[PDB]
Amino acid sequence: IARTFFDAPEKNYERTMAILQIESEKAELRLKELEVRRLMRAKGDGPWFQYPTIDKALIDHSPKATPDN
Amino acid sequence: GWVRPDLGELSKVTKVKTDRPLPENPYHSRARPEPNPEVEGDLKPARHGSRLFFWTM
């Protein structure tokens, strides 16, 4: 029975170790993503939460009809 | 000895030789804010996929 159907205890041991490593990595990445999102929302210096502003390529630079501008 | 200008002569854009220096900052503008850091580096796949609940991709 243990030879045909069942799995070796070493296989289950090392498989559980692999699963635990992957899931701990995922949990740490989730917590880091939460902290990054909070910091980017608070400070606004990152690539996220970049609300748009007025593009400065629209400003006319040629001399106008009045000098005082 | 004066000759009056023709049509379009007084509307020409001319050039002026002056000695006063050019105003380097005529708008009295102050220092501009520093831009955000941009994107650098090649794109790599996400570590363990989406990491959304139980999904392994």
Closest listed residue to residue A23, CA positions, set B49, B18, B38: B49
Cα–Cα distance, A45 to B37 (Å, whole number): 8
CA gap B43, B16 in Å, rounded: 55
Q: Which position has the token pair 């996220």?
A: A48
How far is Cα B57 from Cα A22, in angstroms, rounded to an integer? 13
The strand ranges marked E within chain B are none
B39 in contact with chain A, both atoms CB, cutoff 8 A: yes
Those residues with Cβ within 8 angstroms of residue A39's Cβ, 6 or more apart along the chain or in another chain? A46
Closest-CA residue of A relative to B54 is A23
- Which experimental method was this entry solved with? cryo-EM
**Nearest Cα to A69, choosing from B36, A61, A58?**
A61
* DSSP category for residue A25: H
Euclidean distance between CA atoms B27 and A18, whole angstroms: 64
Residues whose CB falls within 8 Å of the CB of residue A49, separated by 6 or more in sequence, listed in order: A40, A41
Q: What is the resolution of this structure in A?
A: 3.2
CA dihedral A8, A13, A18, A24 (to 10 degrees): 150
CB contact under 8 A, A30 and B51: yes
Round to whole Å and give the CA distance between A34 and A67.
Answer: 53
What is the rounded CA–CA span in Å between residue A24 and residue A8? 25
- Is the CB of residue B47 less than 8 Å away from at least one CB of chain A? yes
* Alpha-carbon gap, residue A24 to B48, rounded angstroms: 11
Contacting residues of B for A21, CB less than 8 Å apart: none
Among B36, B39, B47, whose Cβ lies nearest the Cβ of A25? Answer: B47
